[PDB]
């Protein structure tokens, strides 16, 4: 301990501020010049950030705190210069003069008068002088002012431009990772008036830099991955004009302002769709801006590009609408017959060959309901041009043999055989159409809507299936005709055929399953306007469901189209609309949780997730509202599948422990459909946690509840090694887990993982994270499986052809105009880089190296090299344009 002898600064700045009350009065020079000699020297012993220990700043205030309490207030005759010497010298040590209740008094030295241009003695120092202290002001002092009194005094007026120059100072001194400290400053200051802060910070960023935009640009969208309702409403529209005004990267408009379509205003992204039609230079970014506008996140854009430039600049519209759709058919025609696939594999059924010697002999299984699953050896493998003449003879015999619902099912499988087709898809049906039967034509003409699904061109808006519908005096002609056309025009929000198919609801012909899928057919069409659909559904709901207390054919189908007509907005007006509209008995207030959370597809709104638990948690509920706690858990399944894995680990942690562990009817009947809704990628955490409750069948219940959890355990696409689980459970599933009920089911689970080789993207995440619904086509099936008796009769309309929004697969094609380029692409396990050293290595799995149409996989941001510049949108999206430039030798 070598103290003493060199303690100059603990003596003379211990004495001269102690002599400052001894020299304020009767010493006009010593009041001023010793203050200025104190001020610059204390300023100089802080500017190097290589002596944090300052020989004054924690040496003078031991008496100087009681001094400043008697020097600044008690002088009472403060001059115009001596306030600029006192407050410039004594507002510096006040974060360390004072303890944690400094937060109310960062002003009793400073805001007496802020001396001039306080960064004048705080420019080259990063945060030790006042910039940490400036964040201490905006944390607590501005928030209590700007809680209800934003428009206020000097604590707002100068504080605006004070925070303005400080936010310039973060990107001024060193331009380090304190760029991201500016959104740390801009959002803590005036949390709800963020745009009033950001509007000055938009224009300041526009003149800040054009190279130091992009990491702050991704900092915003990382903060926009989850927020409050109003913060996600605010900072996402602040996110919009920064590649519009500062830079013109601008190919991140269409999908990354589909981010901002539903929250802020539907017309606002349509004004950004107008901003697409402003920046028409030249074609290449314009091409891939409008590639996504048809079948990547929405359709319904084919009405705004038939204006005055219909030569090539507005004749991309039909090219977008069906020709690049058919060029995507040329992927599955040309490229995917080249990689793997002849016309009929037909041998996953043949992969059940070694079972006949496992335990003696075989040929014991003769169940007639297995022949339902026999259609999927032909059915699922023949998607994307698995066209079959006389390979449908297993269909052709069984169509003309028995099983009326399988006559509808085998006829509905023909639409899956010719999918995404307009050229000759109806010609395939017509030879298998004229059998003059109810079940054959109702499955085939429903499959005609599946053939032209995603086309939305002129095939039959009211031609075929409207003529099929007006044939009705009877069975599924009444039913199966409205379903296929609303499936085909689900991407559109056309009003006309919605009003053609609204007298289906207004007929009051009391076929119950027809009116239920009528809500599902109109639900797939619209998500926004036409409140008269909500009027039309609840009229027959109050007519029919009020005079019953019975089955979920009422409940699983009629409120679901209401939720599909109001999907994806966290405004909480739609809950005020719907729940106050059907104020009713609790078995009709089953519908309370539907339209509540169908508007709540994905965000962070954890306050909803607690009312998704705390109202109907358990209660033990002796067989009265057990459907509602299942459906309340059904809406826990979404709002979990897109915070991008932040709550997915928390979802599998809660729902593994809480329900299947300490539950009853909520857990052991229904709570596995989360895993059939959360992901379809597959990973051995949840893929092995389900046979913990499946190999233990727990047969005491109506075990098709647990065998429903068998079924969409294989609701993970992208074919895997999971055959080890399903075939070995199929071996114990032939004799035991009786083949009368689920011999269709286990092979439905077996044959669905290898659906084709490819085309597994059914998982509602495009580009990086945006939805692309999608949800309107899947969510009817997991609402349908509640629970039994639709394994035989009614759910066979659903279980085959429920979800049909598969968009294509792979990010391999090049499309440089003649379509001859391949690439040198380099596929890897996805990004982790958030803020690290510049530049940041995007990925980590350098081993795989392909050129052309190779796979997507679970976490793959595939990059490219060889100086082709890949300049298009720099995110990805499976129709890259790929120009050419090499000006770096």
């Amino acid at each position: 301990m070598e103290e003493g002898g060199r303690d100059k600064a603990p003596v003379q700045p211990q004495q001269s501020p102690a002599a400052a009350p001894g020299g304020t009065d009767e010493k006009p020079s010593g009041k001023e010049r010793r203050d200025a000699g104190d001020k610059d020297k204390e300023q100089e012993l802080s500017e190097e950030d290589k002596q944090l220990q300052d020989e004054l700043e924690m040496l003078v205030e031991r008496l100087g705190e009681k001094d400043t309490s008697l020097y600044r207030p008690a002088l009472e005759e403060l001059r115009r210069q001596i306030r600029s010497s006192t407050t410039s010298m004594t507002s510096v040590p006040k974060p360390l003069k004072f303890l944690r209740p400094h937060y109310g008094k960062l002003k009793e030295i400073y805001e007496n008068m802020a001396p001039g241009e306080n960064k004048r003695f705080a420019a080259d120092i990063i945060s030790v002088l006042a910039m940490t202290m400036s964040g201490e002001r905006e944390c607590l002092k501005y928030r209590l002012v700007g809680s209800q009194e934003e428009l206020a005094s000097w604590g707002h007026e100068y504080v605006r431009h004070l925070a303005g120059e400080v936010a310039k100072e973060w990107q001024e001194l060193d331009d380090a990772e304190k760029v991201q400290r500016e959104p740390l400053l801009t959002l803590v200051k005036e949390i709800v008036p963020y745009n009033m802060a950001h509007n000055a910070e938009h224009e300041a960023c526009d003149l800040l830099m054009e190279i130091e935009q992009v990491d702050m640009l991704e900092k915003d969208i990382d903060e926009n991955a989850y927020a409050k309702v109003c913060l996600y409403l605010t900072s996402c529209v602040n996110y919009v004009p920064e590649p519009e005004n500062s830079a013109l990267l601008r190919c991140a408009l269409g999908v990354f302002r589909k981010f901002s379509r539903f929250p802020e205003a539907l017309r606002l992204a349509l004004m950004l769709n107008d901003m697409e039609l402003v920046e028409d230079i030249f074609t290449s970014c314009k091409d891939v801006v409008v590639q996504k506008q048809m079948a990547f996140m929405l359709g319904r854009h084919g009405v705004f590009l038939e204006l005055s430039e219909d030569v090539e600049e507005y004749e991309d519209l039909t090219e977008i609408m069906s020709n690049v759709q058919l060029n995507s058919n040329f992927l599955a025609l040309a490229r995917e017959l080249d990689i793997m696939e002849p016309k009929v594999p037909d041998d996953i059924y043949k992969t059940h060959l070694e079972n006949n010697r496992f335990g003696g002999s075989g040929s014991q299984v003769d169940s007639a309901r297995m022949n339902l699953a026999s259609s999927f050896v032909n059915g699922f493998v023949n998607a994307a041009f698995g066209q079959d003449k006389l390979l449908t003879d297993d269909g052709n015999k069984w169509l003309y043999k028995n099983k009326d619902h399988g006559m509808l099912s085998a006829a509905a499988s023909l639409g899956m055989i010719l999918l995404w087709d307009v050229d000759g898809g109806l010609t395939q049906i017509d030879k298998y159409l004229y059998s003059s039967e109810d079940y054959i034509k109702s499955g085939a003409l429903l499959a005609c809507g599946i053939v032209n699904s995603g086309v939305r061109n002129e095939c039959d808006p009211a031609l075929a299936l409207l003529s099929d519908y007006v044939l009705h005096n009877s069975n599924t002609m009444r039913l199966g005709s409205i379903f296929g056309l609303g499936l085909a025009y689900a991407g559109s929000n056309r009003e006309d055929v919605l009003t053609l198919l609204l007298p289906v609801m207004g007929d009051s012909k009391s076929s119950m399953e027809v009116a239920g899928v009528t809500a599902l057919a109109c639900g797939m069409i619209a998500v926004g306007s036409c409140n008269g659909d909500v009027t039309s559904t609840i009229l027959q709901t109050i007519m029919e469901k009020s005079e019953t207390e019975l089955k979920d054919t009422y409940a699983r189908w009629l409120p679901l189209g209401l939720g599909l007509n109001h999907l994806g907005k966290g405004e909480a007006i739609e809950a005020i609309l719907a729940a106050l509209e059907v104020v009713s008995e609790p078995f009709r207030s089953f519908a309370n949780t539907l339209v509540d959370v169908c508007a709540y597809a994905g965000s962070g709104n954890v306050l909803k997730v607690q009312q998704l638990l705390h109202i109907c948690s358990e209660h033990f509920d002796s067989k009265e509202k057990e459907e509602d706690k299942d459906k309340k858990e059904k809406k826990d399944k979404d709002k979990k599948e897109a915070p991008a894995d932040m709550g997915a680990h928390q979802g599998v942690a809660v729902l593994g422990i809480a329900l299947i562990a300490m539950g009853e009817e909520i857990g052991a009947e229904m709570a596995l459909r989360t895993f059939g809704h959360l992901l379809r990628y597959g990973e051995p955490t949840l893929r092995r946690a389900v046979p913990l409750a499946l190999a233990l069948i727990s047969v005491s219940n109506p075990r098709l509840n647990i065998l429903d959890t068998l079924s969409k355990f294989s609701h993970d696409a992208d074919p895997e090694v999971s055959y080890n689980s399903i075939f070995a459970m199929g071996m114990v599933g032939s004799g035991t887990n009786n083949a009368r009920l689920a011999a269709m089911l286990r092979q439905l689970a077996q044959y669905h993982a290898k659906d084709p080789n490819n085309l597994f993207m059914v998982r509602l995440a495009q580009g990086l994270t945006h939805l692309g619904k999608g949800t309107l086509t899947l969510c009817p099936y997991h609402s349908d499986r509640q629970l039994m008796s639709q394994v035989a009769v009614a759910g066979l309309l659903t279980v085959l052809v429920s979800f049909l929004d598969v968009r294509n697969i792979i990010l391999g094609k090049s499309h440089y105009v003649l379509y001859g380029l391949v690439a040198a692409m380099q596929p890897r396990m996805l990004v982790t880089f958030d803020e690290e050293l510049r530049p940041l290595p995007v990925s980590v799995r350098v081993g795989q190296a392909v050129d052309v149409v190779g796979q997507a996989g679970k976490p793959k941001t595939i990059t490219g090299f060889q100086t082709h510049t890949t300049p298009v949108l720099l995110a990805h999206g499976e129709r890259a344009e790929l120009a050419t430039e090499e000006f770096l030798p």
Binding site: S147, Q148, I191, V192, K228, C230, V606, L607, Q610, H614
Partner: protein, 68 residues
Amino acid sequence: EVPKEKEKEKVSTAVLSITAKAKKKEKEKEKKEEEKMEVDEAEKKEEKEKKKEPEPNFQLLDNPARVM
């Protein structure tokens, strides 16, 4: 002779988080909806205090009158 009819009925949701400023801006939403369309409800005080003070201590009693 009441049986003390009691209710568990609730456990208080103690999630102390972003909830705190989210309920506060919801009370701001009621200051446009309540006081601008229709709220004119009122109640009166000190009716129940009035009957207490002029009380007896002059209770009249017939012949076989009990008294502590």
